[PDB]
Each structure stands twice: as C-alpha cells, then as structure tokens.
Design a binder for this molecule. Sequence first.
Ligand SMILES: CCCCCCCCCC(=O)N(CCO)C[C@@H](O)[C@@H](O)[C@@H](O)[C@@H](O)CO
Ligand SMILES: CCCCCCCCCC(=O)N(CCO)C[C@@H](O)[C@@H](O)[C@@H](O)[C@@H](O)CO
Ligand SMILES: CCCCCCCCCC(=O)N(CCO)C[C@@H](O)[C@@H](O)[C@@H](O)[C@@H](O)CO
Ligand SMILES: CCCCCCCCCC(=O)N(CCO)C[C@@H](O)[C@@H](O)[C@@H](O)[C@@H](O)CO
Ligand code: NA
Ligand code: NA
Ligand code: NA
Lengths: 264, 264, 264, 264
Amino acid sequence: HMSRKIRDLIESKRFQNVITAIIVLNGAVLGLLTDTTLSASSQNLLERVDQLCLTIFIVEISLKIYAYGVRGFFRSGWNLFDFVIVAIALMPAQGSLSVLRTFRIFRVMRLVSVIPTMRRVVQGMLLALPGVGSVAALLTVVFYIAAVMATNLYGATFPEWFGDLSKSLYTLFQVMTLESWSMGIVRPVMNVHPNAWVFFIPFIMLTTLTVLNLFIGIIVDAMAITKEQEEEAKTGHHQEPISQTLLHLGDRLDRIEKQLAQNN
Amino acid sequence: HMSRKIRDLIESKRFQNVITAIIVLNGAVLGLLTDTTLSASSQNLLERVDQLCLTIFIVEISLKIYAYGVRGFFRSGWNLFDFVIVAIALMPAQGSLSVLRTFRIFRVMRLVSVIPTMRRVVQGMLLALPGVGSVAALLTVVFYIAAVMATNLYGATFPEWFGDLSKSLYTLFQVMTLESWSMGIVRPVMNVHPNAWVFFIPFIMLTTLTVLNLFIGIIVDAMAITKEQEEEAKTGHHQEPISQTLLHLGDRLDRIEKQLAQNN
Amino acid sequence: HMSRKIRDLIESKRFQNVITAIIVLNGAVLGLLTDTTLSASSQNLLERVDQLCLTIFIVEISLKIYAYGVRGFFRSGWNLFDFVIVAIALMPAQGSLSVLRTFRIFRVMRLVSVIPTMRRVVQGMLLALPGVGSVAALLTVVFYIAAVMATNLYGATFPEWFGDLSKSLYTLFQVMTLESWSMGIVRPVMNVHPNAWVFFIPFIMLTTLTVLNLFIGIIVDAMAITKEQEEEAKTGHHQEPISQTLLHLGDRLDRIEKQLAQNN
Amino acid sequence: HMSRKIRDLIESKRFQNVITAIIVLNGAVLGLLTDTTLSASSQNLLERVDQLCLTIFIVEISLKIYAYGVRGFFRSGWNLFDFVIVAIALMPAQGSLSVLRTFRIFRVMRLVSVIPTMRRVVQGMLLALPGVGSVAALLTVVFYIAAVMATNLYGATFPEWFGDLSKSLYTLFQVMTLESWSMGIVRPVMNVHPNAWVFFIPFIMLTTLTVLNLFIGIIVDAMAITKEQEEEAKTGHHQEPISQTLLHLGDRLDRIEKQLAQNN
Ligand SMILES: CCCCCCCCCC(=O)N(CCO)C[C@@H](O)[C@@H](O)[C@@H](O)[C@@H](O)CO
Ligand SMILES: CCCCCCCCCC(=O)N(CCO)C[C@@H](O)[C@@H](O)[C@@H](O)[C@@H](O)CO
Ligand SMILES: CCCCCCCCCC(=O)N(CCO)C[C@@H](O)[C@@H](O)[C@@H](O)[C@@H](O)CO
Ligand SMILES: CCCCCCCCCC(=O)N(CCO)C[C@@H](O)[C@@H](O)[C@@H](O)[C@@H](O)CO
Ligand code: NA
Ligand code: NA
Ligand code: NA
C-alpha cells in the first residue's frame, strides 16, 4: 500500500500548498538575485536557498515517478513539463535552440502546473489554438506579402526600417500595434514616397481586423473550454449544449407521438 | 414608531436627492479649492461649505445607525464604506498604508453608494473579480518572470528602464500598453542587444492577449450580474437561465409521459 | 387626393435617390470650397450650387410639411432634425451655445436621416445610450476625482499638464487613451514625484476597463436594436426572444397536461 | 473518362499539397530577391525558379479549364482570382488603376484560394461585409464632415496636417488610431486654437466607437459564416438555428394537441 499512501500525500491540498510555497520562495530568491549591489555572502546564501528549493522539487518529482510509474507519470503533459523544468537545472553544459538556458525564473511557470485553476486557464488557451490556426495563417500570409512589398518599395530610401525582410517584418509588427506608425514611420516615408499611405493604411485596416479576430477567437473558445473543465473538476461532468438538450426534448416528443397516434 | 418613521424618510427618493445634491456640492467646492489663485476669504468660505456638507453626512449616518441598529447598519458593505469615508474626515492625525489621507475628493465615491443604479454597476464589477482571479494570477506570473528576465538581460546597459525589478515592472507595463514600445524602448535596446525582439514581441503577444481576456471576462460577467440585480430591484426576482427553463420543460414532458404509458 | 399623391412621391425610392444625390452634390461643393487656391469665379459658382442644393431642400421640406401636417411632420425626430439643419442655413445672424454655426458641412448628416438603413444604425446607437448611463456616470465620477487629485498633486510642478482642473481633465483623457502616457507624461512626472505610478497605473487600469465596458455596452445593445428595426422594416414585425418562445412552449404543455389528467 | 480522371487528380490532397509547396517555393524565391547584395548569377537562378513555379501554375489552371469547362471554371470566384493572378504575370506591358503590377508577391495570396480552411476564413470575412456597410458608411460620413471642418478650421495655421482635404483625412485617420494624437497633433494645435479639444475629443469618442462597432460586426458575423461553412464541408449540412429547432418543436406540440382534443 506504500505507493497508494504516497499518492494520497501527493494529491493532498497541504502537499500542493508546500510545493506552491517553495515555488514562490524560489521565485522570490531569483528576484532578489537580480540586485547587482548585493554582497558575496548575501548572493551565496540566496544561491543555497535556490539549491534547497530545487532539491525539494527533485524529491517531489521522484516521489511522483514512483507513485505513478514511469509511463503513468509521463502520460501527462504537465508532469513532463515539471520534469523538464527541474531536470534542465541539473545540466551544466546544456543546448536547446536559442543561446543558453540561463533563465532559471521559468521555474515560476510551475505555479501554473501545480495550481489546478491556473492549469485550466492555460489548458483552455492551448486547446483554443487549433481553431484559430487558419486566422493566424491568414495573418502570417499578409505579414509576409507586406514585408516583401515594403522591402522592395522602401528599403533603399529607408534601410533602418525596411532595409531587409527581417527589418520590414519588425516595423510592420510596430505599424500593426499602431506604435508611432504615422509620426515615426509613415509621415517620414511619405516625404520621399507621397503615396505610401495607399500601402500602410490598408495594411493597418487588414491586420488590426485579423489580429482582433485572432484574439477574440482565442478568448471566446478558451473561456468556454476552461468553464467546461471547471465544471468537470467540481461535479465530474460538464453542462450539455442547448442543441443536445433540444435534441433529447425532441426525442421525448417523438416517443409520446408514437404512444398517441396508434396505441391510444 | 419613531425609528420606522425615520427609515421611511431615509429610504425615500427626496432624502436620496438631498444627500446626492450635497455630495455634488461638496465635490464642486473641493474642485474649486484646487485653484491656487483664490483669495483667503474665498478659500475660507469654501472650507466652511465643505464643513457644512460633512456635518449633513454625520447627521445622515447617525440617523441611519439609530433607524437600523449598530449591527444592522454595519451588515451592509456600502453603509460601512459611507461610515469610513465620513469618519476618516473627522480624524486630524490619521494613518493608513500609503502617506496621508489628504484626498478628501474620495468623498465623491459616495455618489456610487447613494445612487442604486450606480451601486449595481460597481457591485457587478466587484462580484465578477473572483471569476477572473486565475487569469489575473497568470498575468501576474508572466509579468514577474518577464521583469526578472528583463532586469538580468538589460539592466546593466539600460539602467533607467531595467536597472532593477521595480523599473522593469514599470517599463513592461508600458510595453504591454504598447506606449512607445518600439521607438522609445525596443529599437534603442536592439542597438545594443540585436535579438531583443525575441523577448519583447512574445511578451507583447502573451500580455495583450491575457489582459484582453481579463477585461472581457470582467465586462461579460459584470454585465450579466448587474442585469440580474436590475431585474431583482424592479420586480423582486431575476430571469431564470435557459438551462433551468429547458429543465422544467423536460420535467413536464416526463410527467405527461407517465400519464400516457400506463394510466391511459 | 393631392396630399396623398405628394406622399406617394415623397415616400418613393426615386425621390429619396434625388434628395441623396443633392446631399452628395452639396457635400462635394462644400469640400471643394475648403481649397484656398480657387479663383473668385470658381468660388462664386460653387456658392451658387450650394444655394441651388439648399433651395431643393426647402421645396422638399415644404412638400413634406403640407403632405403630413405641421404636427404630423414635427412628430418625427428625423423630420425636426432635417428642418433645423435646413432652416439654420437661412439665418444670417444666428446664436446657439458655442461660437458660430459656420460649419455648413453638418448638412451631410442628412445622408443618415434620408437613408433608412443608415437612420437605423444611428437609432440603435441613440436607443442604447440610456442603458450605459450608469457606466458613463461611473467613468465621469472617476475622471473628476482623478482630475482634482492630479491638480492638487502635480499642478505646481507640472502646470502645463495639471495646472488647473481643465488641464488635468485633458491630460487624464490622453493618459486613458494611452497616448505618450509614460514617455511623455508619467516618466517626466516620476522624476519629481517618484511614486506617481501609484496614481497613474490604477487610473489607467480602472478607466480603460470602464471605457471598454461603456463601448461594448453600446455596441452589443445597438446591434440588437438595429437588427430588430431591420426586421420590422422588412416584414412588419421582429423575431421574438428565446424566453418568450419557451414561455409559449410551456403554455402549450400546460394546456395538454390539463387535457390528459382529468378529461382523458 | 479522361476529364473525370483529371478532376480526381485536381481534387486530390496530394495535388493540393504539390501546388501549395510550389506557392511556398515561389514565395520564398521572391523573398530572397528582396536582397540587394545578391550576385547576378544568384538572382538569375532565383528568377528561373520563379519562371518554373509560374509554368507549374499555367499547367495546373489549363488542366482545370479542360476538366471543368470554360464556363464551369469561371463560375467560381476563387478560380477566376487564380486565373487573373497567374495570367497577369504573362503580360509585359500591363495597366490597372494604380501605377504598375510589379508586386509579384501577391501570388502568395493563392495559399488562401488553394487551402480550403483558409479559403473559408476569407469567405466568412467577405460575406460579413454587406451587413456592416451602413456602419462603414456612417464612419465615412463622419470622416468627410470632420475633414472639411478640420481643413477650414486649422488648414491656414497647420498646413502640414490640415492644409487640404487629403491632408486632413490622413491626420484624422491617425487621430482615430490614437497615434500621437495629443503630444503630436492636438497640444500643438491648442497653442494657437485653445478650444480645439471640443473638436478632437468628440471626434475620437465617435470614431473609436464606430470603428470598434465595424470590427466587432465583421468578426461576429464572419466567425458564424465560417463555422457554418466548416460544418457543410465536413458533414454536408450545417447546424440549424435555435429559432428553427424551437419552431419544429412547436409544430410537434400543435400536432399532438390536435391528436388529443377531438380524436382521443
Ligand atoms: C507576425 C509578425 C512577426 C514579426 C517578427 C519580426 C521579427 C524580425 C526581427 C529581426 O529578425 N531582426 C533582425 C535580427 O538580426 C530585427 C531587425 O528589425 C533589426 O535588424 C533592426 O531593427 C536593427 O536596426 C536593430 O535595431
Ligand atoms: C501588472 C503590472 C504592474 C506593474 C507595476 C509597476 C510598478 C513599479 C514602479 C516602481 O516601483 N518604481 C520604483 C519606485 O521607487 C518605479 C520605477 O520605474 C522608477 O524607479 C523609475 O521609473 C525612475 O526612473 C523614476 O522616473
Ligand atoms: C471624460 C473626459 C472628458 C475630458 C474633457 C477635457 C476637456 C478639458 C479641456 C479644457 O477645458 N481646456 C481649457 C480650455 O481653455 C484645455 C486645457 O488642457 C488647456 O488649457 C491646455 O491644454 C493648454 O496648455 C492649451 O494647449
Ligand atoms: C476612413 C479614413 C480614410 C483616410 C484616408 C486618407 C488618405 C489621404 C492621403 C492623401 O491623399 N494624401 C495626399 C497624397 O498626395 C496624403 C497627405 O496627407 C500628404 O499630402 C501629406 O501627408 C504630406 O505632408 C506628405 O508627407
Ligand atoms: Na494604442
Ligand atoms: Na504612441
Ligand atoms: Na508616441
């Protein structure tokens, strides 16, 4: 019964609270370590607290692997994420895809995986992504076409902003966010190219509409997924859609119609 | 019957109108007192009008405490708020948590507590907060991780904007609001750190999405709570949800099905 | 039958098209008159076209007053608006509440009153205003409290932005719109008052939320009112709410329950 | 059976994938051609790859015209668009309505027409436009009235921003987007015209509300149209509205009421 006694401990509220308190503590020490003025002894102390925090996470994950099984633990995405986050910190010479995994503060993302209500918010957002993939692709297509056009049109006269494809993608993102789009970019561009507005004004109209569509699509779907997940976590099931309720109401009416026309 | 005669006065439309007119008058005199050019006599006069306004609020709250009872009055959050707002002004040497309670203009917040339709708007907003707590926590987590990262990454080269955790939290809030994010912050940062966009562009994408989710969540829930509260204030009850209407419609169909299969 | 023959002309599509074409023509000549470089003869010609346009509107409104009756015409807000717009132009020495009614281009607002689909959009927006009055009042209260606070706190050190109540209302509106709020206003203010963010960041959080609530409230209600008005204009009636459909469905079930329990 | 064998090839997933891969390849070579530093041989090579890509699109469209028929192919808007996009590239001396069709990168818009999920997003957006035409017209009317007013009011003192109708339309679009509206435009204008805020603040209030209404109207309708189109593409039909489900439920209740009152 040892593994079962350990699962009862792991799945308890107090154990979740201890682990949450250690993530907050680890997050607090990493925040204090951003302070350049600190003494060597103060830094050494905080680095030992970070070591103590990480060790508690190793015991916890090992306690989880034994109480669930290697395949049973890695079955959940949140468990694998927690494993990767902790295991990465135990690698001195590491390699990913950017530069170096020196951002230890990403360990505070564990607050999301450990707290179930927070876990459900991220879950809802992630599950809402496939449904907006075509809107996001449409926005990606518009950005690329615009970046190529802006490079060819304005790159030779405005090389800081449109000198290459990378530079144009960056200033088009800025233009889309409406940040200094006119006083900083388009009015100076119009001094050399007077009809530049025929490009930037339709670019703004299209991208702000498409990006708002993308964001609304995520928020609307994510809110409904999380709402359903909150219901299943509390009652064991979620509220059935209006269409299903009306379908079952229609079936009951077809059943009474049969028990009236011939056998009545 | 004295306390009952006083409640009939307190709960009347005319009494509410008199108190509203005194809050507007007190608000108007505090606004005139912002004028530095005013004579000593004009300031003295307006300060006596503020004293007269506050005295009317003391009589009103005392009239309320007697007509409801100490425990009956303090049972409502709006009554306690009105009590605190008025009582605070009668304290010369006060202490809270900031610097000093010299902002007497917060007395105009009583317009919200005294006007029931306005009271319902704030009520709807306040009751909508627990439901967005996890989205707000997710935004708080993202801000903290980002602030620590920005301090470590850019603090030594950009100390005005990222020199410490407090400075980084402030400029990340600015970046999230899209205010001069590129012309003022990220283009100057990219001159020293060319890949800074890999940090700021995903930061903007994530936070604008999460903050919009937080705001939409508040507005959608608050509007429904206020709508229900407006219905209960006018008719005594609110409109039942579609799910409940369909549930009772389903019960009526189960009742007629029973009165058809066997006893018919 | 003369008045009835005139109403058939007035209410026709062709007459509406002629009047629309004259508003567009009048709008086009007023736009050409903004050009400072024009000759005296060109200006004189366009001013005569504006005179011809206005005369057509006088004949039209007079044709409407006779075919409906003085009280019958003025019964509609759109007819009174059309009357005021045209009649105002026939007054040389006029007085309203601002400076002078020299903005003749407001005559292009008649495109809204003459085109029924456009008339319904404005109608929906106007009818949606009472329902957001308390949200708008809440925003007005927050602005006033903030303006008084900003005047007292920052007026002596920042008189251009906060020197008086009017100046503070203006820069708080700018701060609410997020326009240069940090690089232009709050960072310079924080150089003198380091804790200024404790005021401006909660001000931004509260006002952007309240203004979004105000706008969403208008758009959601206006869209539903216009939708109903579009239905009534095409079919003579609008779609009944789901609550009413379920109410009548419930009444039919109560009727069959009565015709089953006792008399069956 | 030749035309039928060709349609089976055209309508297959693999053929769609080959054409998609060629659009991506053509898009990639046009993006590489924005690079000014490239050698003459590298440019020549990429220009031949663009020629090869375009030739594959000619074979594909010709294969489509034969397998469907001239009138059958041109029956679809997407086929005509694909035809125009490819055929335009085979014209050396061309003329449209702007300057010159040198933006070959518009060929990447074929990703939208070739991918059905992407085709449905654009379809939903395009079909949602007639329904917002009156809101867009209302915004067009407000812009024109404002542009004429701004030209007459501020053109002589601010000719860069309001010197003519075109200049005023441009800076009003900027003001509507809230870009440097106060620090860049209205504060400098108020130094000469102190009551300029009476014009710009109501202009901002009205246009941001109307533009948000326009965008929300597009997103809400487009999302529902695309959702219905996604359902019809997968199952052959779409989900019926709640109103229709309740209508058929009401008809079933009227049918059982008839089979109870007289013949029971
Ligand atoms: C969905 C939209 C996604 C937009 C993504 C844009 C990223 C492109 C940014 C990039 O790759 N750069 C090159 C990195 O080497 C940045 C350039 O803009 C940079 O060269 C200039 O800004 C310099 O002037 C540095 O200040
Ligand atoms: C959810 C997001 C919440 C963001 C909240 C950010 C508040 C942090 C602001 C703060 O604590 N500061 C230190 C107060 O002492 C402000 C600093 O940014 C300030 O030191 C610099 O701006 C100076 O250069 C003054 O001009
Ligand atoms: C719901 C929010 C509503 C906000 C409305 C704000 C309007 C207040 C503007 C006003 O009354 N002013 C005084 C008009 O005399 C404008 C001042 O701001 C002005 O004195 C300064 O800006 C000068 O420096 C001129 O450049
Ligand atoms: C729904 C709203 C639609 C707004 C559309 C606005 C377009 C008008 C722009 C235009 O026609 N211009 C004239 C083109 O010749 C641009 C001017 O603004 C330009 O003359 C000045 O900006 C110069 O100073 C150049 O820097
Ligand atoms: Na903005
Ligand atoms: Na800005
Ligand atoms: Na700016």
